[PDB]
Task: structure prediction
Amino acid sequence: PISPIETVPVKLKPGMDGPKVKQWPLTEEKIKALVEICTEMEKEGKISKIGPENPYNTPVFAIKKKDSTKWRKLVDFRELNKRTQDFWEVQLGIPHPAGLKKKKSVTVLDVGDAYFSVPLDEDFRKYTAFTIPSINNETPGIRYQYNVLPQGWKGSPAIFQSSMTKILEPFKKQNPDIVIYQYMDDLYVGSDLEIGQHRTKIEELRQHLLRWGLTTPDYELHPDKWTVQPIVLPEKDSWTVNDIQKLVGKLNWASQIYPGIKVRQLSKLLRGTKALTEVIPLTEEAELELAENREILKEPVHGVYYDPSKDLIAEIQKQGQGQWTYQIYQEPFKNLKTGKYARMTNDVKQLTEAVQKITTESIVIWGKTPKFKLPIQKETWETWWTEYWQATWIPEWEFVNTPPLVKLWY
Amino acid sequence: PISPIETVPVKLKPGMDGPKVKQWPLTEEKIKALVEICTEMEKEGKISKIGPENPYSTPVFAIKKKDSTKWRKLVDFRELNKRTQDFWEVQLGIPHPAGLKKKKSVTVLDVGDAYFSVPLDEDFRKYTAFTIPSINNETPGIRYQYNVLPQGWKGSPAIFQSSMTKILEPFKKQNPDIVIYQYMDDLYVGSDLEIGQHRTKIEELRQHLLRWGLTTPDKKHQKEPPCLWMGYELHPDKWTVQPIVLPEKDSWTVNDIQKLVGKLNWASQIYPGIKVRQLCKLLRGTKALTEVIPLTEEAELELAENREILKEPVHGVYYDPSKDLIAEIQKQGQGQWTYQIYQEPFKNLKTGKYARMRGAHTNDVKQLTEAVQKITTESIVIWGKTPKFKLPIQKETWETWWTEYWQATWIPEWEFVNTPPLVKLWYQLEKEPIVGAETFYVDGAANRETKLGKAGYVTNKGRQKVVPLTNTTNQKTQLQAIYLALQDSGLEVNIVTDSQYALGIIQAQPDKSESELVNQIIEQLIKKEKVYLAWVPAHKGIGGNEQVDKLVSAGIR
Ligand SMILES: Cc1ccnc(SC(F)(F)c2nc3ccccc3o2)n1
Ligand SMILES: [Ca+2]
Result:
């Protein structure tokens, strides 16, 4: 009753090499937290010091658990994932229940600490290499690899699936209408129970886990409260030439996306070559057009479906005064979902919160995270994003230094 | 000697065999040298004679290299290197002296024959096999293999470094307040002990180093009072760049001008004010390396302004981790910027300059921010924390812009400092249409085949105009229409465009550009009292926008 278990053979993608990502410069306090965390991890047999014959790297970050309560170590396996993950989610994928988004309440439980139980395939360990940097490059820097399944990594939940099925089976049998979805270090638990009682069911579920390696796990999402109804058409919007012109542009564009946008009664009213600030010699058949048009904007884009074989991508615009608009689409403007996030300070604080919130929606909705287009300077995001990150995954990100009049439409 | 250190397992690249390169024939001289040298080597354990049982060979040769009229032995490891696994790192960052904490004493220790002092793997030695050749390849060569790290082998820098780090750990653990920096062959050792006891401690280190195979052939702790390293001169208590004689000529080749700029660029990390744009201007359209470029008047000013700053030496101080860092930035020149970082007022740890590029069109508030951002990264690397900034920008100037601007931003805590010139907004676009201002439906059109363009406008006041244009894209005829509106408009004006593109540029309130049509527009924009810019979509037959198209695309397309 005390030794290790037996390991699943793991292959990197067909003739692909491991990650050789540059570690990003980090703050002193974070370095400190990082060697302190890793000292334990090493003593607990989880990581070992590696030598120079391992050319691989994967960046590492430390984040605060809530705020100043503890430091967590976060590993960025985005690259390792890409080089493992055309071929997984296939040979050993985990299906996504459509029912999850339809549940009144979904609770996110971090079951990451479980993975630290199962040993990682000897010949795969070298790829999990990471480096604790030193300040000013004064010291070569502490290097490690993993011995057990690492938390950043998409292979972990894939391997662990079997244990999760057994662990979870009694519970599911006893509540066949609870929807439990595993995505990386978290379980998503969904149910149509009332809120307390939902929570009691979460607690009960927590005990099933606790018997197996999860050190008292973990939220609350109410998916059927996630709303579309965006692209707004003003109300005292039927006054000026400038109002109408703007309105027409808003519709002109919407008719790219949305089958049915009328706009013609509206192109009239303008008729002449007027000063921008003139109030209007029409407002009749057009107001009906406006009505109709508005009502098609409440509802889903008719033409557009989620294609599981395509990257979800997400745009975000800064609306100012703490508001942010966002779109999830697979091809530009065929929007799967559109939304808002508001804090009514910072800018990057709010953005990282936006991204996080969006990722979670995307996960509960489609079982993928989006590729984010971020309206910020790369350098600035790199410097600052870990300061507010709280999640255990990291989605891919581009930076989009442009925004059209796209900000306005939204 | 050879270190008792545990060897680093090394393997060839997947599915690849060791090198089997045929040894070319050498001159007698060179053979004799090779035999002599190898003997010494064989004697010291470095090398080992081997059978023809071993396949594999990597060519050897010999010459007078580093004026080596005692003869140096070379091994062409190209083939083995292509066949050896990548290793970690190689090395990939160096310290900046401004991060060093002040010491009473530092000394250099050069490791003896570092590479040759570290054992090679053993399961790998076989591949390092080489062959001293017979006089006229008539008879079998002498075959050796390496037992230590060879000179040009892919992994020798990484393994040596690795080996040295391990070796150093117990001594670092027993002496937690001594600072050791490993750089190639050298160790720099820094302490706050009194001259005598510091010398004791080096000797201990030397002793620890000898226990591990590594001679420091420097007895009595060699060095010399000012350390010269990676272009710096380092002292226990201050630091600087090392030379920087700027020659005195009437004629500068392109080459001379490059060297000169590199040098000034180097100096500028400790000499505040260094400036090189006029010197860089001379470099445009590289006109051959060997060719003389008459210094412009603007350049001669700079070169002298520079000699001025390098008149007397300046030294950076070192870092007290108990105090805050402060970063001061100053606008200086056009897209140019300069900065000082310091802790006690004006004892610069270091200095720098920034002269950006982050787009075709930009403005001062943007560029000051990108500079702030570059310094922020630089600070985290060097000192592991962020500096408190002092900035030539009003708090309200910055808040106005950034709360308005669509991209997001954040900078560390900062204060306004009145170091003229200040950053301001030369113009504010209006947020709403202007009552009683002439509305100018501007429009463009180009043929894209002939390149023939018409840019004009129509107004609500009935005013119209279309002027013809020639080598233009659809895009310039947008920017020309808008500019045409700004010339013929009063101080206040509304402008309707249908150019996503043109609206994009102007909305970002630029104050500078790599387009000439644009610097013009910005001139107009500054002079105006109120400009409102609105966007309608192309050829949707809109009131006002329709009519400009009837007479823009007539001669357009
Ligand atoms: C010269 C000086 C001044 C203050 N502290 C130090 S510490 C050091 F010697 F380890 C050290 N020597 C170095 C040489 C180059 C780069 C970093 C160094 O650190 N050194
Ligand atoms: Ca146009």
Summary: The CA atoms of residues 383 and 406 of chain A lie 27 Å apart. The domain at 307-410 of chain A is CATH 3.30.70.270 (Alpha-Beta Plaits).
